[PDB]
Structures are given as C-alpha cells and as structure tokens.
C-alpha cells in the first residue's frame, strides 16, 4: 500500500465531508470539507488570519491549554505520562528529543519494550535546531517547544486504534476548541525521524500548521523500500499512531497575538525590548500597526531569503504605508528580540536537563545556543544577563529541573567570559582573513566557528564591514547543528566468527567470585577457544578482560585475552590449543579479577559521589576504552577545586566504609526505568527486553560487569589525578584498594 493510497484508506475524511484536492498551493494533495473554495494551505498563498482575530473559543494560557489537552485525552482512555528530558538519555542514536515519539524509540517502537500506557497522552518539550534559522522570523518557529500528543501502539492482531480514530480525535479536539471542520485542512506529507516514518496529515487552521498526524508503519532499514528525505524505510510488523500538537501554536491561535513569542513569553520579549537599543516603543499605535500587518505575512516571507522575501518585503511595505527601510527598522530588530527570547528558553531546558557546554557531543549544541544568545544580547546591547532571562522563563513555565538555577547562572557566567575572549581576538582574526581572501565561503564561516568559536553572524558582518564578498548561508546554524545532532560513527565494530555457535553461558553475571568452572570446548577458531559456558569476563562494559587458563586431560592452556562475538565468548590462547570437544576446568586469575572488581565497583561509588558534590549536571562523559589506568570521565563545566576533590574522595570513602550492599538482577526495561530513572544509562544504553541492573550503594546502573558484594570490599579510594581532557569533560584517575 503506497503512501498515496494510504490516505484513500481513511473513511473518516470522506464520511465527514472532506474531499481530496490539489490546488496546487504548495503542490501537494490536501483534504478540505469546505465546498466553497480550494486555494487552501499554509506556506504560499494563505497567511495568518487569526492575528487580531483568535480562531479558538477562548484565549488559553500555556499551562491551561496544556492541561486542557491532557485532560481531553485522559477522559478518552489515554493514560497521562510525565515529560522526558530534552536530552535523549534513553537512546544513543540522537542527542536531543526532536519529537514526542522520540521518547519511545527505538525500544518501544520496535516492540522490544511496552509503552508507559496504551494509549498514552503527553506534553513533550522538544528541541528542533534545524528550525534555528527561521526562529524569530516566521512568527511560528521555536527551537524548544512542547509537542502534545496521543500515542497508540499497535501490534499484529492487537490494535488500540488507527488512522480513522486518529484523524477523528484531532477533528473533535479542534471542533471543541472553536474550529469547525470546514476550517480544518489536512495536507498530505510524509514524516520521518528517529528511525521511523509513515504517511501523515498536517492539521492546518488559520494559515498555520498546528498539529501533525503520522500513521507510523515504516522503520529505517538498510534494505529500505520507501525513500524519505535521504533515508530508506521498510514496512514494520508493528504500526503506531504518532501525533504531535504544538502547545505554543495552539495558545497562539487562541490569543491571536502577532507572533507565537508574544503568546507564550510576552514578559521576556517586553523586558528584552525595554532593556535594549530598540529604536521603537512597545506602546506606539504606529509601531503596533506595522508589526500586526507584517506579522500576518511572517509565515510567507519568513520562509524566504535573498530576492525571494525581498519582494514580499515590498508588498507589505506598500500596504502598510512607510517604506521598506522603515519596515526593516522594526522587523529586523524584533527578529532578534524574538530569537533571544526563544533561545534563552531553550537554554533553560538544555541546562536544566543536564547538558554541559563543550566542543563535542550534545554539549556542543548547548554551547552553540549560548554563544548565539550572547551574540544577540550584544547586538541589542541587552541591559540584563542571559541568566536573568532564563530565570524569567523558569518562573513563567513553573517547571522543575534536575539542575538548579544556581548552577545555570554559574555556567552562563563562565560561557560569557569565554565568549568575551573569543570575540576580542576574533574580530582581528576575521579582519585579517578579509585582507587575505576577500571572499568568505560557507566552509570558511564553518571553520571559524568550530576552530575559534566565532559566531557566524559576527564573522559575516565584519567581512561585509570591510567590503568583502560574503553572504549569510542558508541554515548555517542548522548545518553546524546538523553536523552535531547525533552520535558519531564509532568504528569499534563487530567480529564475525566463520561458524555459528550457541550464545556462551556467561557465568560471571550471578557470581563475581566464581573463579573456577567446568566447561567443554565447543569450537576453536585461530586463537579463539570457545566453550559452552565460562566465567571469563570479556573485555567490555567498563572493566578490562580476565586472565587465566583452562586445565584438562592435556595440561594447562593459558588464556591471555578474551573478546566476544555476538554472544559467543572468545578465549585467546596461542600455540598449544585444546581439541574441540575436550572437557576443561577453567581457572581465572584471582588478582586480575579482584582488581577489576574493586575499581569497577569504585567507578559506581565515584560517579555517585561526583553527582552529590558537584551537581546533577554530572553525567559519565563516556568510556572510550583504554584501561591502562582506572579512569572516569564526567561532564563538568570547570576544574574541580582542591576542596571539592577532597570532598569527592571523602564522600566516596564514607560510602565504602558504610559497607552498603551491592545487588544485581535482570529486570524488564520499563520496570527499571520506572524505578530508577534514566540515570540507569550513564554507561550507555544496552539492548534487550530485560537488562541487568546493578546497585552499588545508592547508585543504580544497567551494567554487565563484575562487582564486589558490598562497598566495603572496594577498599579505600584515592583520586590520583584530575584532568581537563576537553571543555566540559573532567577525567578522574583513581586507585581502589591498592597503589
Ligand atoms: C508527529 C511527528 N513526529 C511530528 O513531529 N510532527 S511535526 O514535526 O510537525 O511536529 C508536530 C507539531 O509540533 C509543532 N512544531 C514543530 N516544530 C516546531 C517549531 N520549530 N516551533 C514551534 N512549533 C513546532 C507544530 O505544531 C507541529 O505541527
Ligand atoms: Zn584559524
Ligand atoms: Zn558496573
């Protein structure tokens, strides 16, 4: 069934007065229930029509509309669920939450795990950096926004509800708010993201897309069949209702203010204006008349650049009255007030949710937003600090964060200092480059941002200032952001044994002190001795590989190293190798095993201690292997002071001395997450319907390594070295129960 005929499947549209057309007006197919006319749509010929004339019954406040939407589906069988953080801790393919459906990928959407409820409803804060360049310009784009949704997870033979019920829900909700089906347009478009896709319907009312309804039955797979924005997708066994209603867009359509920004955080926009170099006044009836008429077309000209929006700029300039220049005398400065207002809000969530600024990973996106905000504040000569705007955003929303405003302030203050030094020597650097190249390219502006932290608009300006050939590239930030939106490709990859073997019976999971066992050689490839069951720990998780030997009716075969291949453990032996079928008595070296057990259990205690002392922004930076030393990398915005380090060590040793219990047991994912939160994935996200959960004291992680039985077995913990590997990442080298 093709995407096209996938829409001819929905009996709800035709049975409710909706007829399929194709204007063009965007050139796509769409469904309208209005018999009078079709020229309907969003981007090209419609424009906002609700500005000054709300389209909903009453004007809702952010929190009221949020509650109204959630209760609406709760009284319709949907289970309410709390938002997920904006940092995708539960996965490893993407850094931030780009859609509510992203909370449930890839384990729930693939069936590996069950959804929190079914069907469920939620208001998920999302971050869309790809819209960065249109923020503040179209009147409808934000970087951080809440996508309200109702999801239903269907499996073959078990359907909660599909397309008909989905579209019916959106119409009903809309109608109940004050919009008649005659004014609701459903445009057809494909939707993909996070590894899934499907045909979708965009709900367009008043010239604005307020929600999208996706019938998810496609999943990204190598042998893909469907082509959607570069990726290939095949039809899944499961199918999912994937909807998303923009809370801020609903509120905006309920107030009819000039822009979404004036609808969700007017205080912030006003404050910025009142404390900047804005040439106009937010009370003048004149200015108000200009913005209003311009706001109505924002959706059109906002999606254009160059000679494109250049003409519409004239259209509105005429109708309004004054010249194009006067128009730009307000719109352009406002585009920056709206962006700063928006960006400081996105910072609230990135920082409040645990992101630490850096030049790598998700931290890079945090630093990207902050630098751009610092640059916007500078252009406007903001009389307040970014922090002041963030705190304001915080009290308006009323949300609670893992990271307190206190730490947020500290981070923004340090970023501001780094930015100050960057710009100082950065101006000269670009002035110099202009004398040399006289023509700056897209890749030139890229290198300047990444290698010298120079804001693109700061470099494109100085260049033009010196009469240099250069022009603001399309989605340059989205381009920079896109280059840092997902986890890089780690070439540490798979080993494929020439023969298929039954998954090794790992014996170390249950008993960490089982150094001796009995097994049979069920295969031998090169140096890879393979048994049916073994206590030997393969080089993985956080601890290094075991070392020992296999005894049998043949002598003693020393195992020097141990890897693994898709479940089969490999015992590396050279020269005198066992005969496939021999029965052996494996003996693991006690010292090597205990050393790793202590240090690995210490890693947990240390991680727990680091968070308690430094703050909830502390998260394991990663374990990019090299086990020469016992090390732990974490996200922290500066070097720990000597007293903090002293305090980290002290707290860990009090935990060890307390000799708390260390436990482990296989647990279903949903059960684990519900009980321990996403702090469960600090060391990575493992696959499986059931994950091994380890509890070292009060720290809880999905871990597959061998640990001590109680924290007292770790021995004293001594921090031997604290180093700043890279901005936002600090390395702790330590010893546990030894030198
Ligand atoms: C359901 C599908 N996964 C999806 O995400 N559809 S969507 O990309 O269109 O997003 C759903 C809704 O969130 C809101 N939204 C999307 N991006 C936005 C942005 N950058 N700023 C403000 N609102 C946005 C709009 O109402 C949009 O219709
Ligand atoms: Zn350089
Ligand atoms: Zn562990």
UniProtKB/Swiss-Prot annotation:
GO terms for biological process: alanyl-tRNA aminoacylation. GO terms for molecular function: alanine-tRNA ligase activity; aminoacyl-tRNA deacylase activity; ATP binding; identical protein binding; tRNA binding; zinc ion binding. Binds 1 zinc ion per subunit. Disulfide bonds: none annotated. Keywords: Aminoacyl-tRNA synthetase, ATP-binding, Cytoplasm, Ligase, Metal-binding, Nucleotide-binding, Protein biosynthesis, RNA-binding, tRNA-binding, Zinc. It is an enzyme of class 6 (ligase). It is found in: Cytoplasm. Its EC number is 6.1.1.7. GO terms for cellular component: cytoplasm. Its cofactor is Zn(2+). Zn(2+) binds at residues 600, 604, 703, 707. It catalyses: tRNA(Ala) + L-alanine + ATP = L-alanyl-tRNA(Ala) + AMP + diphosphate. Transmembrane segments: none annotated. Belongs to the class-II aminoacyl-tRNA synthetase family. Catalyzes the attachment of alanine to tRNA(Ala) in a two-step reaction: alanine is first activated by ATP to form Ala-AMP and then transferred to the acceptor end of tRNA(Ala). Incorrectly charged aminoacyl-tRNA(Ala) is also edited in situ by the editing domain. Homodimer. Consists of three domains; the N-terminal catalytic domain, the editing domain and the C-terminal C-Ala domain. The editing domain removes incorrectly charged amino acids, while the C-Ala domain, along with tRNA(Ala), serves as a bridge to cooperatively bring together the editing and aminoacylation centers thus stimulating deacylation of misacylated tRNAs. This is Alanine--tRNA ligase. The gene is alaS.
């Amino acid at each position: 069934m093709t995407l096209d005929e996938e829409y001819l499947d929905i009996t709800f549209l035709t049975e409710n007065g909706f007829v399929r057309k194709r204007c063009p007006k965007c050139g796509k197919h769409f469904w309208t229930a209005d018999p009078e006319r079709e020229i309907c749509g969003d981007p090209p010929c419609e424009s906002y029509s609700f500005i000054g004339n709300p389209v909903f019954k009453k004007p809702f406040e952010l929190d009221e509309m949020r509650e109204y939407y959630l209760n609406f589906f709760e009284r319709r069988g949907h289970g309410r669920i709390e938002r997920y953080p904006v940092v995708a801790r539960w996965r490893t393919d993407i850094y931030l939450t780009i859609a509510s459906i992203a909370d449930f990928q890839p384990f729930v959407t693939s069936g590996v795990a069950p959804p929190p409820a079914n069907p469920l409803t939620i208001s998920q804060p999302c971050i869309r950096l790809d819209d960065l360049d249109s923020v503040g310009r179209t009147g409808r784009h934000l970087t951080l926004f809440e996508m309200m949704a109702h999801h239903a997870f269907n499996y073959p033979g078990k359907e909660i509800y599909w397309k008909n019920e989905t579209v019916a829900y959106c119409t009903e909700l809309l109608n109940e708010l004050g919009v008649k089906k005659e004014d609701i347009v459903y445009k057809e478009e494909p939707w993909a993201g996070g590894g899934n896709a499907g045909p979708c319907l965009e709900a367009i009312v008043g010239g604005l897309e307020v929600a999208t309804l996706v019938f998810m039955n496609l999943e990204e797979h190598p042998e893909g069949d469907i082509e959607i924005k570069g990726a290939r997708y095949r039809k899944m066994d499961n199918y999912i209702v994937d909807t998303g209603y923009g809370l801020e867009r609903f509120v905006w359509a309920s107030k009819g203010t000039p822009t979404v920004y004036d609808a969700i955080f007017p205080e912030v926009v006003d404050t910025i204006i009142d404390n900047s170099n804005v040439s106009f006044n937010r009370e003048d009836e004149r200015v108000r008349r200009i913005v209003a008429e311009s706001s109505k077309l924002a959706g059109i000209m906002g999606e254009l650049r160059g000679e494109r929006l250049n003409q519409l700029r004239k259209s509105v300039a005429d109708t309004v009255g004054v010249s194009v220049e006067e128009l730009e005398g307000i719109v352009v400065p406002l585009e920056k007030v709206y962006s700063l207002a928006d960006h400081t809000r996105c910072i609230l969530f990135m920082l409040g949710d645990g992101l630490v600024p850096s030049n790598a990973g998700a931290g890079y996106l945090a630093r990207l937003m902050i630098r751009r905000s610092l640059r916007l504040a500078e252009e406007l000569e903001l009389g307040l600090d970014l922090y002041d705007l963030v705190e304001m955003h915080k009290k308006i929303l009323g949300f609670e964060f893992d990271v307190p405003l206190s730490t947020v302030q500290e981070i923004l203050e340090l970023e501001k200092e780094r930015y100050r030094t960057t710009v100082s020597k950065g101006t000269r650097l670009v002035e110099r480059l202009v004398e040399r190249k006289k023509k700056l390219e897209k890749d030139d502006l890229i290198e300047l941002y990444d290698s010298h932290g120079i804001p693109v608009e700061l470099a494109v300006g100085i260049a033009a200032e010196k009469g240099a050939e250069v022009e603001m590239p399309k989605d340059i930030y989205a381009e920079l952001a896109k280059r840092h939106s997902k986890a890089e490709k780690v070439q540490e990859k798979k080993i494929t044994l020439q023969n298929e073997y039954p998954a090794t019976e790992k014996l170390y999971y249950d008993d960490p002190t089982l150094l001796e066992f009995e097994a049979e050689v069920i295969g031998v490839e090169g140096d890879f001795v393979i048994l049916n069951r073994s206590a030997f720990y393969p080089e993985s998780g956080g601890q290094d590989n075991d070392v020992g030997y296999l005894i049998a009716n043949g002598g003693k075969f020393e195992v020097v190293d141990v890897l693994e291949a898709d479940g089969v453990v490999l015992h590396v032996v050279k020269g005198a190798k066992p005969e496939v079928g021999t029965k052996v008595k494996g003996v693991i070296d006690s010292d090597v095993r205990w050393r790793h057990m202590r240090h690995h259990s210490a890693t947990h205690v240390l991680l727990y201690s680091l968070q308690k002392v430094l703050g909830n922004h502390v998260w394991q930076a990663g374990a990019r292997k090299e086990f020469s030393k016992a090390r732990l990398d974490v996200t922290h915005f500066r070097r720990p002071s000597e007293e903090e380090i002293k305090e980290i060590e002290m707290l860990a040793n009090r935990e060890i001395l307390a000799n708390k219990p260390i436990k482990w047991e296989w647990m279903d994912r949903i059960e684990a997450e519900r009980k321990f939160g996403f702090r469960l994935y600090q060391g990575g996200v493992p696959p499986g319907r059931k994950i091994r959960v380890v509890q070292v004291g009060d720290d809880v992680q999905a871990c597959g390594g061998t640990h001590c039985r109680s924290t007292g077995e770790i021995g004293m913990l001594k921090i031997l070295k604290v180093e700043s590997i890279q901005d936002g990442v600090i390395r702790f080298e330590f010893a546990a129960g030894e030198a």
